[PDB]
Design a protein around this ligand. Structure first.
Ligand SMILES: CO[C@@H]([C@@H]1OC(C(=O)O)=C[C@H](NC(=N)N)[C@H]1NC(C)=O)[C@H](O)CO
Ligand SMILES: CO[C@@H]([C@@H]1OC(C(=O)O)=C[C@H](NC(=N)N)[C@H]1NC(C)=O)[C@H](O)CO
Ligand SMILES: CO[C@@H]([C@@H]1OC(C(=O)O)=C[C@H](NC(=N)N)[C@H]1NC(C)=O)[C@H](O)CO
Ligand SMILES: CO[C@@H]([C@@H]1OC(C(=O)O)=C[C@H](NC(=N)N)[C@H]1NC(C)=O)[C@H](O)CO
Ligand SMILES: *[C@@H]1O[C@H](CO)[C@@H](O)[C@H](O)[C@H]1NC(C)=O
Ligand SMILES: *[C@@H]1O[C@H](CO)[C@@H](O)[C@H](O)[C@H]1NC(C)=O
Ligand SMILES: *[C@@H]1O[C@H](CO)[C@@H](O)[C@H](O)[C@H]1NC(C)=O
Ligand SMILES: *[C@@H]1O[C@H](CO)[C@@H](O)[C@H](O)[C@H]1NC(C)=O
Ligand SMILES: *[C@@H]1O[C@H](CO)[C@@H](O)[C@H](O)[C@H]1NC(C)=O
Ligand SMILES: *[C@@H]1O[C@H](CO)[C@@H](O)[C@H](O)[C@H]1NC(C)=O
Ligand SMILES: *[C@@H]1O[C@H](CO)[C@@H](O)[C@H](O)[C@H]1NC(C)=O
Ligand SMILES: *[C@@H]1O[C@H](CO)[C@@H](O)[C@H](O)[C@H]1NC(C)=O
Ligand SMILES: [Ca+2]
Ligand SMILES: [Ca+2]
Ligand SMILES: [Ca+2]
Ligand SMILES: [Ca+2]
Lengths: 394, 394, 394, 394
């Protein structure tokens, strides 16, 4: 086993093809499937896996009550092979966690899981299934991380964490690790900005992240850093807002540097992603400007470098009559593709239950996964598909 | 790992011995088993696997309602070891799919799964579990494929697809791939003919296919092609019709070149198979001429080359009091047999529920699998065996 | 991988220690566990597995109705790791089968499974999971085999089959195979004798079998053969009868050559085992002389060579207040023990339901497994432990 | 594969970070999870596993009735990957057992399981899944062992067993084994002392054990021995009692040599652990002095060598409003950590049901696991989390 380089350029893609759909909630109507949320995908040299935060309880069981709640001692990071339901018998335990990130360095799996009290949480770093290091909360205010794949290059793995208020200035840090040990860290200066739940991917030896601003921005923060943790921080330049909530495109003016908000969009957001394509960008967003429903991906001409409103391509993978949720980025390594570039992929979380579906006592999600290809691909609507309410709700 | 040659001659066999029976629906009365249809078997260097199209739902669950329906965003191609039920905890996710084919090239599994809207579907090609390529619908009319094993020879894998009307002239294409990338394609000129759901196998370096004509033929199309995708197309010469519906043998006159139909047999069919045996042929068919019930296999003397009605051997593996369905061909590679020829095998789908059993809200199937041997083997009736209706039907 | 020699002498043992108990029926009260019977154990170079004949149905499900029945198209030979319940998600499919034997030659698993009609059954031989050969019924009267491990030595695997009446003179054959192909066979001349369900093991390069006489003998047939299939046949000499039904010891006089019966013991029996120990023998038997209840193993001084009634050791592993059933022999290869002799082990089937427990609609069994050790070991009573009737019975 | 040295010094640690939580009882409300107790963790070269004693029955099933009972023929030692629920489909069978220990020598798993009658029990030693040796009861009074990981160094594995009265002078023995064969044993002279359920770990080539005195001591016995089975025996010197029941710290005076008890603490106890840290000690204990509730770990300055009451650090991992139970020690080998010292870890059993929760008919437990790290780590309360009573209790 050797470390994955992962220093190749990101592939330029013209479309996204569906790779998997787990149908976990449909299956969990009768099968034994964890209540989850915050799923994500990460790939190693030979396989991709779906990670997720369980609620330490199964669908259609009484312990699924009140699972809209974000943090508890019962939540765990676990994984299954890509496409499998997050079920009770295939799930691989990764970490105790109510917030997490994971990735593969070419030799072993790295998993970072945060648990503990809101005012004194800590991340446990697991490497090859063994606990190796810890990161303590430095602001004592809900230490939290990506809820998507971290990035490994040349044997070093990188991720972003936040600590501090949800709706005002917080603290943002980049971490570097080798074989599960933290070897470097850097605080990101971002006055007036807010960074959470970064979706990051490798691109020509740098880590590029598209994040969530839960404060004053309906545009998404962009964070780019190198192996030294030297960084650039700002916002996705595009004159098309991609957070939720947001306003209609025509009411929005882009900015490369400033959080753009107001108009009832402040103080919330949703995890999302984008992929740089030279000077352009593929960016995902919910179809609804106000709720987590529908999902589409847009190719915005020069959207990485200027306040462009030029949409070159748009593909819908979930119509606005169906519930979405988080989305995130990952890449497929050269060892699986034999290519000279890294294939950009994204996953989509489809949340069922509370708060949108009040007649259910629970909250869970299922996923779809899509990967970039060199040609245009039609969209469709691959919805969660579960019929609610469930037995336990009656 | 090396590519499988698969250029050996097909074995001549005198009988078919039962290899497996999954009893999936019986088990699914209580166990957690997917609702499926369109099962098939494919073999790699070291194991054979049963593939199937799920309905993204389990037996005896409410989500099994209306599963007679052919296409949805919830259907997936998955696999289990040969003989296992298609259950929720062993199933390996292969592709999103409401139509599919899969095979092993000696190094990795190839899976081709079609999803999307009827008027803009696309196949995603998965190789070693990674998405590698896409094939878009070229006629925008339910792009569809074999529902059985594709064929790999010398590192290249081949399959047949159709796009166009179900009951009139459509378009038929052969595809060639290497490591999951389409490297060649050829449209098959077949005016007045109709090709669907080809059952294909290697024979002395060529691919031989026996298909379904859903238009004017109660006889089965034969398609034979080489590595260049140069092809011969026509019908199984035998003066014994093997599609369903069909007429009694004595009311049928064979043709090597023309669809032979009429007499209330037009506009439907069922997936089936045949194996060339020199100039003769082993061909499967339902026992009923009008419904998918019973199953028998016939050795027809010179049936590959002339309109022979001479039945040399006949073996029944399912009596006409029990439901059948699709059947398909595969081969066992030399790496498992140590032989100098490729062993012909077939599987049989046994459909339960709608439309024949109206008191059930669902449709699924189970399977039996048989392989050719050098001696005569007695038949029997290995029926699905489930007792309907199920709990969910009441 | 190399073929196992298995030509070492059988170990002399002074006691039997419990190795596993699967508790399958207890577990199956709620878990998803096959209805089975005729379990047995066989060992490969690196693991031992429990094989069993399913009824193609799960415990506590309606399809378990009438599972007292011996033969159906739904029965399959499957296996799990030693000690596991025969459950729906770990079970490995081996063969379609209502009668079977299996063993490992050092390179691959051999499984022989008989299915088909009573008057035209056939065994399918599976090697490394691939069908390799067939054995047809030669008397057309319920072709049947050991229901325990076959024996492999130097790359050749051997087993015994019977065809003919259950309660009068039948036909008995020994088979030799290499890589799943039958390479030799020999009919055993045994006029007035009856052989079924042989429990066989290797001992100094010969195969020694202890069988069931279902005709005129309450003593057990002994069959010993070499690689040429040259054989000796007779009865266990001991003046202690070990079949069930039988009479009390004091009413029995042994014979090395003749079936000894009468006194209401004719026309039935139970699968059992014995291990030669020089001139002595370890022999198992039910505690009850009339029913399949309790289980004990006896060391009979010189019991292999003369009509001895001298019981040197007796160990009970199941008291007579609990149901037993079949028992059978296997050995542990040198590759697992590092010893110079083959360790004798036995398994015990504990049948629940019909016919002894009439208030249940089903019949299944669970198992315990014991291996010989160089010292005396106390007995106990490790009963099935399930509480009947089950939910499905009400 | 080579034998693990395991002769390194134990790491000095300043805190304990949570590594896993299985949530087994929560999951078992709907999933198929064994009723268990006496869980423990042991690590091999490449993975850690959770071992447990099942009751041969599943949660929420009628066979869970009366599982407060300690010993039966249905109990088995099984294992799952660290963090998994002890479920019906992942559980690996290890030994028949109502008392057990297990560990990995670098090449294979060793498992020691005791079953049989109270007055004639015996341990079966399993090595690489094969039975290798037996240890008989020498006092004929509930032969019993650690209920936690044994210790392997340089290819030899060591464990402690007890035989004799629960509440008066018993007999205590140390065992040494190589490849599953007992190669040495030594009786420990400890007049007036009582040793049960030792928690042992390697430290600089010696085995250090912290045990339970079920007779006259509310302080814990310490047993230290070398490869010759030469030993030192006494009590944890600290002037802080760590058994349960016990008295408040201020009412206790330590002793290195004598059982300190009385004040209603005699004749009971609970399995616990401690780790030497030079002259100091990390010791676990329930928060309650009288019941198995809460759990905390204390660093006591010089507590290994003198009657110190100086508590340097205290971390609570379970508050006193929640049920605890047994706790035990294990280490992570250098092959997983790349360190020069052995990482000390502990697990915590959280018992639900009888006797504390009388409205449940059953008793089971779940676990949390923590490993030592080089920095201080905050505590929290990671409770079992199941909501009782369960369905089966109503
Ligand atoms: C507190 O809410 C944060 C998180 O947001 C939400 C949500 O669906 O929007 C899900 C998470 N749930 C979990 N990851 N478990 C959160 N993050 C946490 C740590 O609660 C937010 O980003 C503001 O800080
Ligand atoms: C539309 O019907 C087609 C297919 O036929 C049927 C059937 O049981 O006969 C099952 C399929 N179900 C699936 N493979 N899911 C079909 N094929 C599709 C793509 O629907 C037919 O061959 C005509 O074009
Ligand atoms: C027909 O009865 C035979 C078998 O005996 C019985 C029984 O519990 O005694 C179980 C078997 N069940 C299965 N192996 N399935 C039988 N053997 C068969 C082939 O039915 C007997 O040995 C006489 O020929
Ligand atoms: C008899 O009680 C002993 C054991 O203690 C208890 C308990 O929760 O305290 C659990 C065990 N349960 C099991 N390991 N199954 C016991 N040990 C046994 C062998 O019963 C005790 O240590 C006195 O000898
Ligand atoms: C969920 O919690 C609410 C509030 O306690 C309760 O009223 C309801 O009955 C619970 N549902 C279940 C299934 O326990
Ligand atoms: C992607 O496109 C950009 C803009 O044309 C170009 O600079 C870059 O080389 C491309 N990357 C790859 C991997 O083709
Ligand atoms: C199946 O669908 C039909 C039509 O909506 C409905 O009447 C019936 O109740 C459904 N059955 C179940 C179990 O949901
Ligand atoms: C099969 O039979 C045909 C016709 O006799 C013959 O040409 C061919 O060689 C045979 N194939 C094999 C593999 O034996
Ligand atoms: C079992 O079969 C008998 C006879 O047909 C029937 O009376 C009984 O109801 C069946 N039990 C179940 C659970 O189907
Ligand atoms: C078993 O005992 C017999 C009788 O003493 C003896 O001939 C034989 O050598 C022994 N076998 C072994 C393997 O010790
Ligand atoms: C548990 O055992 C008691 C005593 O026999 C009995 O009263 C109770 O009904 C049992 N509960 C169950 C679920 O069997
Ligand atoms: C642990 O600390 C003790 C006391 O200072 C010291 O003697 C020992 O060397 C330390 N062990 C390690 C592995 O650092
Ligand atoms: Ca926002
Ligand atoms: Ca037709
Ligand atoms: Ca008899
Ligand atoms: Ca005590």
């Amino acid at each position: 086993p050797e470390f994955l380089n992962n220093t190749e350029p990101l592939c330029n893609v013209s479309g996204f093809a569906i790779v998997s759909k787990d149908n976990g909630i449909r299956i969990g109507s009768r099968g034994h499937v964890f209540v989850i949320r915050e799923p994500f995908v990460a790939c190693g040299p030979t396989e991709c896996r779906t990670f997720f935060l369980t609620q330490g309880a199964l669908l259609n069981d009484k312990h699924s009550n009140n699972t809209v709640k974000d943090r508890s001692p019962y939540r765990a990071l676990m994984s299954v092979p890509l496409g499998s339901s997050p079920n009770a018998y295939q799930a691989k335990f990764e970490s105790v966690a109510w917030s997490a990130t994971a990735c593969h360095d070419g030799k072993k799996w790295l998993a970072v899981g945060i648990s503990g009290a809101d005012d004194d949480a800590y991340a446990v770093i697991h490497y090859g299934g063994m606990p190796t290091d810890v990161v303590r909360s430095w602001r004592k205010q809900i230490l939290r991380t990506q809820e998507s794949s971290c990035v490994c290059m040349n044997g070093n793995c990188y991720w972003v964490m936040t600590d501090g208020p949800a709706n005002s200035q917080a603290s943002y840090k980049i971490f570097k690790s080798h074989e599960g040990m933290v070897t470097n860290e850097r605080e990101v200066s971002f006055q007036g900005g807010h960074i959470e739940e970064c979706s990051c991917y490798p691109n020509l030896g740098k880590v590029e992240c598209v994040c969530r601003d839960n404060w004053n921005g309906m545009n998404r923060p962009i964070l780019i850093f190198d192996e030294d943790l030297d960084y650039e921080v700002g916002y996705l330049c595009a004159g098309i807002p991609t957070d939720t909530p947001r306003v209609q495109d025509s009411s929005f003016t882009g900015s490369c540097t400033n959080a753009v908000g107001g108009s009832g969009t402040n103080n919330y957001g949703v995890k999302g992603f984008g992929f740089r394509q030279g000077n352009s960008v593929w960016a995902g967003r919910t179809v609804s400007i106000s709720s987590r429903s529908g999902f589409e991906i847009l190719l915005i001409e020069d959207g990485w470098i200027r306040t462009s409103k030029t949409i070159v391509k748009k593909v819908e993978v979930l119509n606005n009559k169906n519930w979405s949720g988080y989305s995130g980025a990952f890449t497929i390594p050269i060892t699986m593709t034999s290519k000279q570039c890294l294939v950009p992929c994204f996953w989509l979380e489809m949340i069922r239950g509370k708060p949108e579906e009040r007649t259910s006592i629970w909250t869970s999600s299922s996923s779809t996964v899509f990967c970039g290809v060199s040609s245009e691909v039609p969209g469709w609507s691959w919805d969660d598909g579960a019929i609610l309410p469930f037995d336990i709700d009656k």
